[PDB]
Amino acid sequence: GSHSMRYFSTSVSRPGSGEPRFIAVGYVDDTQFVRFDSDAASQRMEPRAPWIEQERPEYWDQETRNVKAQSQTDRVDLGTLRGYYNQSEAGSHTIQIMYGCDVGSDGRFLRGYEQHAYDGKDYIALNEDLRSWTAADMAAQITQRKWEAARWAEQLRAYLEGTCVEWLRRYLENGKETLQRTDPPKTHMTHHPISDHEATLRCWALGFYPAEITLTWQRDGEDQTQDTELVETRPAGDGTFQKWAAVVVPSGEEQRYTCHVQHEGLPKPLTLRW
Amino acid sequence: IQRTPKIQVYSRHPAENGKSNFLNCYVSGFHPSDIEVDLLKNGERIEKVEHSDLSFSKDWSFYLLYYTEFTPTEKDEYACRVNHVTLSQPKIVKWDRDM
Amino acid sequence: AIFQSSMTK
């Protein structure tokens, strides 16, 4: 199948309490594999998946140097943005960045992306062409004009089409048993009365990977979102995910309702009925 | 702009009295990232609790999984206590085994 | 592997 590598970072200023807190994590699809935390004692990039541990000490030296270098950029940018927005020195602010690349089944580059946020709102994003930017407001337009003039997108594009893809290809093989798997949802329905006249049907999906799933309720084969409810997909803690969807129904009409489950690991979508 | 946490409290495997399991508190949808999350057993904070590394979703809100190994019983009650700037007092969410 | 370069805003 197709796959992604993504790096996420969060820098939080702490005025009058030292350097910003910087935390970075790397993922291949929905599997985390590295972390760095500027408050931790090691001051190293650290493994967070079994299949990255085999990388040799040169790898960890490289990842540590490069994640620390990004943390220095972000610390200076916290000051710059405080200035762009004419904000006080007293307040804590956050810069978040996510970038990544996607490959197909044969490892060919599909697409790259990079997005930046300030205080949890869009700040600047690389466009899908990997050649130009979209700024969210007048401050980010300063950054846009600067990065355009410096041809910065060219360096990012070279990473996203090049290094990014090569390393993702490698991780997919070294971590094949974990990363090239699809675990289909184990599904079941529960049924309980709410009262004399209504019952709850709950449709469960357990133990699935990757996290992407769709749970749909239908009524006489026609889509139904009136009187339904679904929880956010959640991690089980062991590398699989859980989700459920429920519907409140008139007692005696359970037969009309169907739960439909779509997941990459199912040859065919499932239909569950009570 | 601050976003209040969503909270789910649940077990890794279906709960079986006297069978070891993992108690999860999944906190998501929140901003800023500074947060305190504790797992409680009959109202008392469980000492040994671990959590995932800070990450965030497409809408920039943060999420964390807090978890501990536990062996459920019929009488023991579990909860998750979330302390965040958006909450005027900490929010305590009970573990419902059916949920 | 993380991107080895970054540019200030």
Numbering used by the authors:
A (entry chain A): 1 to 274
B (entry chain B): 1 to 99
C (entry chain C): 1 to 9
Quote the original article.
Here, we found that RT313 also formed stable complexes with both HLA-A*30:01 and HLA-A*30:03 through co-refolding assays. Although peptide RT313 was able to bind both HLA-A*30:01 and HLA-A*30:03, circular dichroism (CD) assays showed that HLA-A*30:01/RT313 (with a mean Tm of 45.4°C) was much more stable than HLA-A*30:03/RT313 (with a mean Tm of 37.3°C). However, HLA-A*30:01 could only bind peptides cross-presented by A3 supertype alleles. Our crystallographic data showed that although the key residues at position 74, 77, 114, and 116 are different in the F pockets of HLA-A*11:01, HLA-A*30:01, and HLA-A*30:03, the binding modes of the PΩ-Lys residue of RT313 in the F pockets of these three molecules were quite similar. The NZ-atom of the PΩ-Lys residue had hydrogen bonds with Asp74, through a water molecule in HLA-A*11:01, HLA-A*30:01, and HLA-A*30:03. Similar to the direct hydrogen bond between Asp116 in HLA-A*11:01 and PΩ-Lys in RT313, His116 in HLA-A*30:01 and HLA-A*30:03 could also form hydrogen bonds with the positively-charged anchor Lys. Although residue 77 of HLA-A*30:01 (Asp77) and HLA-A*30:03 (Asn77) were different, the NZ-atom of PΩ-Lys also formed direct hydrogen bonds with Asp77 in HLA-A*11:01 and HLA-A*30:01 and with Asn77 in HLA-A*30:03. In HLA-A*30:01, even though residue 116 was His, not Asp, the F pocket still had strong negative charge, thereby allowing HLA-A*30:01 to bind positively charged amino acids, such as Lys and Arg. One mutation, from Asp to Asn at position 77 in HLA-A*30:01, enabled it to bind to the A1 supertype-binding peptides MTB and NP44. This indicated that Asp at position 77 restricted the binding of the F pocket of HLA-A*30:01 to the positively charged residues of the binding peptides. We previously reported that the HIV peptide, RT313, can be cross-recognized by HLA-A*03:01, HLA-A*68:01, and HLA-A*11:01. Together with the current HLA-A*30:01, all of these HLA-A alleles are A3 supertype alleles.
The major histocompatibility complex (MHC), also known as the human leukocyte antigen (HLA) system in humans, plays a pivotal role in activating T-cell immune responses by presenting antigen peptides on antigen-presenting cells (APCs). HLA-A*30:01 and HLA-A*30:03 differ from one another only by five amino acids, three of which are located in the PBG. In this study, we determined the peptide presentation features of HLA-A*30:01 and HLA-A*30:03 through a series of structural and functional investigations. To explore the structural basis of the different peptide-binding characteristics of HLA-A*30:01 and HLA-A*30:03, we determined the structures of HLA-A*30:01/RT313, HLA-A*30:03/RT313, HLA-A*30:03/NP44, and HLA-A*30:03/MTB at 1.5, 2, 1.4, and 1.6 Å, respectively.
